């Protein structure tokens, strides 16, 4: 997250770190959201590679013991059936991961609340992106969980020529684009939390930014719109 600030350790209890085994160690690769005690939602493009993955919940500092982490293997990966790796702009950038064991809920570990199906945010709605992604274009991952305030940009605007044009679809949400704050590598799969009727819900799964850098004016971060996929999510979980 570029232009972010350190999150309080109990602000975003549905946030997870997806990590892969790298030699003798594990390394953070993207974010995601806990949606059942044994299911995680992330971006499809995060699990494109044939790696060994684990999920870490209750994480705050990637490089120190926080005393709150639970580590759990990924048992099954279900990517959206329409997803196509060489066409992120077509959408369907979403995947569910079944965990090997169910995690225990506490003040650091909670289920993410999803929006009702079909819900669309008005232009300029207040949202926070959270994650451990790069803190500058071509930079390094954050140690501690970061958050940034990124107001939504509605489809009519973000699909106009000076923004994303037809690369953005109605199945997506855009947020940010002020040139100071944005998502960045390592944030993919992570949540966009928006305050609706007094309650934060996860409205987006971070999907892509502009190859011209993370924080670029009029290239808001693009997220998969979770409220477009409520039935898909229910169906997968009901059938697995």
Per the annotation, the verdict on 93 as an active-site residue is yes
Out of 14, 17, 60, 93, the active site residue is 93
- Interacting residue with Na ion among 10, 11, 38, 61 (CB under 5 A): 61
- Does the footprint of Na ion cover residue 10 (CB under 5 A)? no
Query: Distance between CA 101 and CA 117 in Å, rounded?
Result: 28
- Does the footprint of Na ion cover residue 144 (CB under 5 A)? no
User: Which of 165, 158, 154, 169 is closest to 228 using CA atoms?
Assistant: 169
Out of 17, 159, 182, 188, the active site residue is 188
For residue 149, CA distances in Å to 4, 5, 92, 124, 239 come to 8, 9, 25, 11, 36
User: Which of 233, 238, 237 is closest to 94 using CA atoms?
Assistant: 233
- Interacting residue with Na ion among 11, 37, 66, 185 (CB under 5 A): 66
* Nearer Cβ to Na ion (66/171): 66
Per the annotation, the verdict on 45 as an active-site residue is yes
The least CB distance from residue 224 to Na ion, in Å, is: 27
Piece in contact with Na ion (CB under 5 A), picked from 2-10, 58-66, 156-164, 178-186: 58-66
User: Which of 111, 123, 141, 203 is closest to 4 using CA atoms?
Assistant: 141
Per the annotation, the verdict on 86 as an active-site residue is no
The least CB distance from residue 69 to Na ion, in Å, is: 5
User: Which of 158, 147, 236, 139 is closest to 200 using CA atoms?
Assistant: 147
- Does the footprint of Na ion cover residue 185 (CB under 5 A)? no
Contact 44, 83 (CB under 8 A): yes
Q: Which residues are catalytic?
A: 45, 93, 188
Question: Binding residues for Na ion, per CB under 5 A?
Answer: 61, 66
State the binding site for Ca(2+). Answer: 59, 61, 64, 69
């Amino acid at each position: 997250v570029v232009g972010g600030t350190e999150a309080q350790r109990n602000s975003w209890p549905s946030q997870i770190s997806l990590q892969y085994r790298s030699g003798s160690s594990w390394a953070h690769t993207c974010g995601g959201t806990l949606i059942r005690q044994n299911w995680v939602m992330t971006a499809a493009h995060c699990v494109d590679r044939e790696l060994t993955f684990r999920v870490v919940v209750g994480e705050h500092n990637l490089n120190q013991n926080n005393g709150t982490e639970q580590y759990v293997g990924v048992q099954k990966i279900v990517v959206h059936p329409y997803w196509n790796t060489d066409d992120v702009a077509a959408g369907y950038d979403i995947a569910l991961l079944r965990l090997a064991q169910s995690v225990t809920l506490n003040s650091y570990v909670q289920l993410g609340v999803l929006p009702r199906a079909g819900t669309i945010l008005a232009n300029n709605s207040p949202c926070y992106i959270t994650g451990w992604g790069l803190t500058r274009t071509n930079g390094q991952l954050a140690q501690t969980l970061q958050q940034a305030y990124l107001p939504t940009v509605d489809y009519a605007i973000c699909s106009s020529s000076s923004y994303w044009g037809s690369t953005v679809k109605n199945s997506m949400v855009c947020a940010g684009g002020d040139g100071v704050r944005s998502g960045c590598q390592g944030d993919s799969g992570g949540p966009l939390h928006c305050l609706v009727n007094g309650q934060y819900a996860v409205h987006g799964v971070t999907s892509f930014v502009s190859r011209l850098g993370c924080n670029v004016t009029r290239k808001p971060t693009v997220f998969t719109r979770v409220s477009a996929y409520i039935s898909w999510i229910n169906n997968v979980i009901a059938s697995n």
